[PDB]
Write a protein that binds this DNA or RNA. Structure first.
Lengths: 796, 17
RNA sequence: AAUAUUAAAA
C-alpha cells in the first residue's frame, strides 16, 4: 500500500499569515556511519546505556573514536560523521563506571551507510521515499546532548522543578519541559519544539508519600486492610533510597505485617534495626517495603527517588489541577517556545556542529486559509438557518430539523429529597418543557412517573418496572448527586439490558437552571429519541453526495496503566449526514489495530442499507487514535478489512474507499502572525484555519485544519493524513468536507476539533467502559447494546 | 427527514440484510 | 452526569 500523493494545493478561504513551531534544519549532502551497539548486561535503562557509551568515547580515543563526537540513541544505534577505524568485525570493550563501580561489556559492529544526500533528493524530487534511516540519524544527533543533560520521557525532556512547585496531591508533582521531534516538510527537515508538561512523583520521604496517598495529617494507628492495599497499588514498582547507611531499591510489595512483626532469617525488622544502626523506629506499627528474596525496608528510612514519571491515571481533581497549571494563551506559548529556542542554542551544540547541521532561529512563516463555515439548516415553523460566527452559533429563533414530540416520560431522582425537594423538580421540568417547545421538541405531558430512589441496585427493578407499566415510554430523566456508581448502572441497564432512552442530569444543574444548559440537554434528548437537530444545507456539499456514500468514524481506547482495549466504529445512516449507528468490541489490551473491523463494517453497511435502501458507492473512513510508527501496519490490516467486508457482502461490490487518519496528539502549534487577527482571550487562530503547505509532507496528501474556536490555552490543529483515496478527492473537496463534518456534531451548536464521525466513535468507546463496570465472552457481552438501542444515537 | 433524494431506490441487487 | 475547549494519554 503506497499512500496517495498530494493531488494539489487548496484554494478556498481567506488567507491568514501564520507562524508554526517548526524550525528549518539544514544538513550537508554527506554520508553518516551507523554502528550497532551491544551492552552487557543488556536490560539496563537507557540513561545507564548513555553513561556506558560516554565513558568509553572518553577513555578510548587513541585506539578508536579519536576526536570524533559520536551520537547515541540510548539503545543500539550510534552515529559518527566519519567512519571509525574498524572493519566489518566486532570490537569489544571492558568498561567500568562509577555510589559504587559497575563493570560493563560493550561490543560495536559496523552496520550500514546512511545517506543525507539521499534525504536531500527526496525533499526536492520526491522520486524516492523519504529515507527513515536518514531521518532517524538526524534526530539522534540533534537530541544527543539533551539526552545527557535532561530526563527523557518519550520525545520530551524535563528537568527537576527549581523554585516552582505544582503539587497534584497523591505524591505527584508537575515537571515542565519541552518536546523535540524532527520531521520532513516540503521545503526542508523541520525541528519541532514545543512546551511540554507531565506528572512526576515527589522526591519526598515514603512516610510523607504514604500520607498524601491516604490523606492523613499526622494519632497513631496501624494501616487498615483497605489502606494497606491502596498504598501498595501506588508504590509497587517504584524505586526508593535508604538513609540509614545510600543505596537504591525497587519496591515489589508491601508486607501484610508491621515492622515489629515482620521477620526474616528468626529476627524482626525492628530488632534488626536496633541491633545495628542503633535505630529505634518511630513507626513500627506500619508495614515494611519488600525490595522472591526476603529483604524488607521500613517506610521511615526510605525516600522516593526523584525523576520517576507517573504513568498511572490521575483522578478528576488531579487532571483538573494540572490543566490549570499548564494552560497558557497562544501568545504566551509563542514567547515560551521562543525562550526554549534561545536557551537551546542548537547551532552552538558541539554534536550538531560535528555533523554540520544548521538550525533556523525563528519560527517558520506560512500563509494558511480560513475556510468558510457551512450553513446549518434547521426546521420547525421558521425553517431558519444558522450562520456560524467564529465557529459558534446558537438556537435563538430556531427549531430542530426534525423535532421529537415527547408524550410519555418519567423522572428518577437519585439525590436525597433534602437536596432536591418537589418544589425544585417542578421548576426544572417547567423550564425544560418551555425550552423544549421553543426548540421544536414538545415535552407535552407531565411525568407519568416521578419517584425518589437511592442506590445503584434500584435502577434495574425500577427500569424493569417502567418498561412494563408505561406503554409508549420514550425517555427517563435521571437526576444524580454528582459522581456516583449509579451512572454506569443507569447506562448499563438502559443501553445494554432493557433498551430505554435515558438522560442523566446532575442535581447541581437542577437546583440552578441555566437556559443554555437546558438547551444543550434538548440537543441530546431530541437525538436520543431518533430526531435530527440540523442538517448541512444540501446544495453546498461535496459532489460525493450525488451517489450513496457512508461516513465511518473509528477509535481505539486502551486501559490505564487486566482491562481490555475497546474499539468503536460508527456509521452514517443517512445522506445529510446526521444519524449514526454504532458498533463496539473488546480486544486484548494495547492492540492498536481494530481486529474486528471487517465485521463491524459489515454491520454498519447492512444498517445503512436498511435505513436508506441504498448501497454506498463510496466509503469515507476517519480513523482516530493512531500512533505514528505503527501506521503502515494499521492501514495494511484495516484497509484490507474494509475491502474484505465489501467482498463478503456481494460478489462484485467494489465501492471506493477514502482512509483518513485524524491525529490530535501532536506538537504542531500554529499562531497568528498579525496580532490583530488573534481571537478571544486565548488569542488563538480562527476556526477553519487550514494549512497544506510549508510544514506538511513533501509529496503526500496531508493538511492541518483547526476547525474549532480556542476557548482556553493554545489550540491543537487537527492533522489529517489521507492514506488511501479510491475516490480521487481534490484538496479543496476533502478539506471543505472534513470542515463541514465538524459542524454536524449534535451535542453543541459549535464547530468541534475533529469530525463528528470520529468524535462519536470516541463517545461510543467511553460509554463501553461504563458498561464494563460491576472472561472474554462475558466482557464481549457487556458491551453489546440492546436491539432497540442499536438503532439510535444512545452515545450522545 | 428523507435521508434520500439520491433518487432511484433500486430493486436490482442482493438484499444483504 | 448540559456542553465545547484546554494538559496528559534484609
Amino acid at each position: 500500500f503506497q499512500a496517495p500523493r498530494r493531488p494539489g494545493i487548496g484554494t478556498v478561504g481567506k488567507p491568514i499569515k501564520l507562524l508554526a513551531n517548526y524550525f528549518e534544519v539544514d544538513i550537508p549532502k554527506i554520508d553518516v556511519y551507523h554502528y550497532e551497539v551491544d551492552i552487557k548486561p543488556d536490560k539496563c535503562p537507557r540513561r545507564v546505556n548513555r553513561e556506558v557509551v560516554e565513558y568509553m568515547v572518553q577513555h578510548f580515543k587513541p585506539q578508536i573514536f579519536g576526536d570524533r563526537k559520536p551520537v547515541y540513541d540510548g539503545k543500539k544505534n550510534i552515529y559518527t560523521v566519519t567512519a571509525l577505524p574498524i572493519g566489518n568485525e566486532r570490537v569489544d570493550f571492558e568498561v567500568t563506571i562509577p555510589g559504587k563501580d559497575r563493570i560493563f561489556k560493550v561490543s560495536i559492529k559496523w552496520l550500514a551507510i546512511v545517506s543525507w544526500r539521499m534525504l536531500h533528493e527526496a525533499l526536492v524530487s520526491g522520486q524516492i521515499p523519504v529515507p527513515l534511516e536518514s531521518v532517524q540519524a538526524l534526530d539522534v544527533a540533534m537530541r544527543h546532548l539533551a539526552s545527557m543533560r535532561y530526563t527523557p520521557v518519550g520525545r520530551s525532556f524535563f528537568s527537576p522543578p527549581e523554585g516552582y512547585y505544582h503539587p497534584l496531591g497523591g505524591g505527584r508533582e508537575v515537571w515542565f519541559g519541552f518536546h523535540q521531534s524532527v520531521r520532513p516538510a516540503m521545503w526542508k527537515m523541520m525541528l519541532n519544539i514545543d512546551v511540554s508538561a507531565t506528572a512526576f512523583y515527589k522526591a519526598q520521604p515514603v512516610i510523607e508519600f504514604m500520607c498524601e496517598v491516604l490523606d492523613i495529617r499526622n494519632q497513631p494507628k496501624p494501616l487498615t486492610d483497605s489502606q494497606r492495599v491502596r498504598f501498595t497499588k501506588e508504590i509497587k514498582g517504584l524505586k526508593v533510597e535508604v538513609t540509614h547507611c545510600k543505596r537504591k531499591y525497587r519496591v515489589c510489595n508491601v508486607t501484610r505485617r508491621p515492622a515489629s512483626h515482620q521477620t526474616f532469617p528468626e529476627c524482626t525488622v525492628a530488632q534488626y534495626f536496633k541491633q545495628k544502626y542503633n535505630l529505634q523506629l518511630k513507626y513500627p506499627h506500619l508495614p515494611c517495603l519488600q525490595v522472591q528474596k526476603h529483604t524488607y525496608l521500613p517506610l521511615e528510612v526510605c525516600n522516593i527517588v526523584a525523576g520517576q514519571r507517573c504513568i498511572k491515571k490521575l483522578t478528576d481533581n488531579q487532571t483538573s489541577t494540572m490543566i490549570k497549571a499548564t494552560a497558557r494563551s497562544a501568545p504566551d506559548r509563542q514567547e515560551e517556545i521562543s525562550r526554549l529556542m534561545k536557551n537551546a542554542s542548537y547551532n552552538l551544540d558541539p554534536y550538531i556542529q560535528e555533523f554540520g547541521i544548521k538550525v533556523k532561529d525563528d519560527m517558520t512563516e506560512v500563509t494558511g486559509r480560513v475556510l468558510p463555515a457551512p450553513i446549518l439548516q434547521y426546521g420547525g415553523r421558521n425553517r431558519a438557518i444558522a450562520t456560524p460566527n467564529q465557529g459558534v452559533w446558537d438556537m435563538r429563533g430556531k427549531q430542530f430539523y426534525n423535532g421529537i414530540e415527547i408524550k410519555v416520560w418519567a423522572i428518577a431522582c437519585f439525590a436525597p429529597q433534602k437536596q432536591c425537594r418537589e418544589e425544585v423538580l417542578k421548576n426544572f421540568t417547567d423550564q425544560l418543557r418551555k425550552i423544549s417547545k421553543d426548540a421544536g421538541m414538545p415535552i407535552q405531558g407531565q411525568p407519568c412517573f416521578c419517584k425518589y430512589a437511592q442506590g445503584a441496585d434500584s435502577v434495574e427493578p425500577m427500569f424493569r418496572h417502567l418498561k412494563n407499566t408505561y406503554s409508549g415510554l420514550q425517555l427517563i430523566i435521571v437526576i444524580l448527586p454528582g459522581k456516583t456508581p449509579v451512572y454506569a448502572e443507569v447506562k448499563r441497564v438502559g443501553d445494554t439490558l432493557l433498551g430505554m432512552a435515558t438522560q442523566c442530569v446532575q442535581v447541581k444543574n437542577v437546583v440552578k437552571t441555566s437556559p443554555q444548559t437546558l438547551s444543550n440537554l434538548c440537543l441530546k434528548i431530541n437525538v436520543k429519541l431518533g430526531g435530527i437537530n440540523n442538517i448541512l444545507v444540501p446544495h453546498q456539499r461535496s459532489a460525493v453526495f450525488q451517489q450513496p456514500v457512508i461516513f465511518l468514524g473509528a477509535d481505539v481506547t486502551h486501559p490505564p496503566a487486566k482491562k481490555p482495549s475497546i474499539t468503536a466504529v460508527v456509521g452514517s445512516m443517512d445522506a445529510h449526514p446526521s444519524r449514526y449507528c454504532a458498533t463496539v468490541r473488546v480486544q486484548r489490551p494495547r492492540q492498536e489495530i481494530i481486529e474486528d473491523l471487517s465485521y463491524m463494517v459489515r454491520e454498519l453497511l447492512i444498517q445503512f442499507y436498511k435505513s436508506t435502501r441504498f448501497k454506498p458507492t463510496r466509503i469515507i473512513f476517519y480513523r482516530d487514535g493512531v500512533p505514528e510508527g505503527q501506521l503502515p501496519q494499521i492501514l495494511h490490516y484495516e484497509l484490507l478489512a474494509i475491502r474484505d467486508a465489501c467482498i463478503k457482502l456481494e460478489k462484485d461490490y467494489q465501492p471506493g474507499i477514502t482512509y483518513i487518519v485524524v491525529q490530535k496528539r501532536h506538537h504542531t502549534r500554529l499562531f497568528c502572525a498579525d496580532k490583530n487577527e488573534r481571537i478571544g482571550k486565548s488569542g488563538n487562530i480562527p476556526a477553519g484555519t487550514t494549512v497544506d503547505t510549508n510544514i506538511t509532507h513533501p509529496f503526500e496528501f496531508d493538511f492541518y485544519l483547526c476547525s474549532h474556536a480556542g476557548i482556553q490555552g493554545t489550540s491543537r490543529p487537527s492533522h489529517y493524513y489521507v492514506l488511501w483515496d479510491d475516490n480521487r478527492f481534490t484538496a479543496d473537496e476533502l478539506q471543505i468536507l472534513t470542515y463541514q463534518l465538524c459542524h454536524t456534531y449534535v451535542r453543541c451548536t459549535r464547530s468541534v476539533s475533529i469530525p463528528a464521525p470520529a468524535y462519536y466513535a470516541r463517545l461510543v468507546a467511553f460509554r463501553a467502559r461504563y458498561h464494563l463496570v460491576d472472561d472474554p465472552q462475558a466482557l464481549a457481552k457487556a458491551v453489546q447494546v440492546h436491539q432497540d438501542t442499536l438503532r439510535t444515537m444512545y452515545f450522545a | 427527514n428523507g435521508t434520500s433524494a439520491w433518487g432511484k431506490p433500486i430493486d436490482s441487487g442482493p438484499s444483504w440484510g
